[PDB]
């Protein structure tokens, strides 16, 4: 797992039980100085054999010699507008706003495609007590308003 240790080795040499010329020591399993292309991977527990694929969040990965070789899969993205004022963007990034207007939440860049609005106005007493009130969708070349 920790390969290439000897490039940062600030110790002199002594006696003890070691490995041969190649044949790195098995850390993840329990055996001895196994060859490098028999290193079992691991992923929160399970001892994956070298060649067992797995389907993760947005990528699929295969256990190569000790390391994972991962390849991307298509997965969507979700913007959320929760509470009165808690925006979570498509890329993480949660923030608090407390507005009073119509605001452009998402719109297509080309010339037309769509535009999603949303009213974030005060609902309580002060200005810091805001609420979502109206969602407006401008679709089908911006000629249909929902």
């Amino acid at each position: 797992s920790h390969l290439e240790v000897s490039s940062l080795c600030e110790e002199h040499r002594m006696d003890g039980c070691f490995c041969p010329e190649g044949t790195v020591y098995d850390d993840i399993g329990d055996s001895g100085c196994v060859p490098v292309s028999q290193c079992h991977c691991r992923l929160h527990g399970h001892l994956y054999t070298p060649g067992q694929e797995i389907t993760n969040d947005c990528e699929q990965c295969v256990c190569n010699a000790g390391r994972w070789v991962c390849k991307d899969l298509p997965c969507p993205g979700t913007c959320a507008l929760e509470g009165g004022s808690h925006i979570t963007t498509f890329d993480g990034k949660t923030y608090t706003f407390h507005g009073d207007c119509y605001y452009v939440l998402a719109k297509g860049d080309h010339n037309d495609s769509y535009a999603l609005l949303g009213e974030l106005a005060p609902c309580g007493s002060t200005d810091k007590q805001t609420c979502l009130k109206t969602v407006v969708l401008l679709a089908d070349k911006k000629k249909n308003a929902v």
Binding site: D140, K141, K143, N144
Partner: protein, 146 residues
């Protein structure tokens, strides 16, 4: 779909009238009359009482560019019985069997009879009341000049 009890329904689902969209709009001004306007140039008027009737209006830009049981709209009426595979038919029921929208419909034929000879009790009622279109004491003689 315009059923014969009102009941306008879009994609097998009831709609509420009026229903104005980007490409067409459906109105209902008088509860026995439906008015449909399209942006292409097509206008419909569906009558619902006493019997169901239909009136279709096209612009003169669509002249020589339609096919159906309404002809082709080119100025001549000798070629309205021209089928979609060549030649002009002779009778109305021979032309119109080429415009069936379902393949499992039977073929219909003309009827060289008049109904006022087959029914002696209906033919005096028909003579007394339809003659009001021709006599000038009624409020139908105002239209006799046009």
């Amino acid at each position: 779909v315009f059923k014969s009890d009102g009941s306008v329904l879009l994609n097998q689902l009831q709609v509420n009238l009026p229903h104005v969209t980007a490409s067409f709009s459906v109105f209902r001004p008088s509860s026995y009359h439906i008015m449909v306007s399209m942006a292409i140039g097509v206008r419909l008027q569906v009558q619902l009482a006493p019997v169901m009737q239909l009136f279709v209006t096209l612009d003169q830009a669509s002249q020589g560019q339609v096919q159906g049981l309404c002809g082709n709209f080119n100025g001549l009426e000798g070629d309205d019985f021209k089928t979609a595979s060549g030649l002009v038919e002779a009778t109305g029921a021979g032309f119109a069997n080429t415009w069936k929208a379902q393949s499992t419909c039977h073929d219909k034929l003309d009827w060289l009879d008049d109904p006022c000879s087959l029914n002696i009790e209906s033919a005096n009622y028909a003579e007394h009341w339809c003659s009001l279109l021709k006599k000038t004491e009624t409020p139908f003689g105002r239209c006799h000049s046009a």
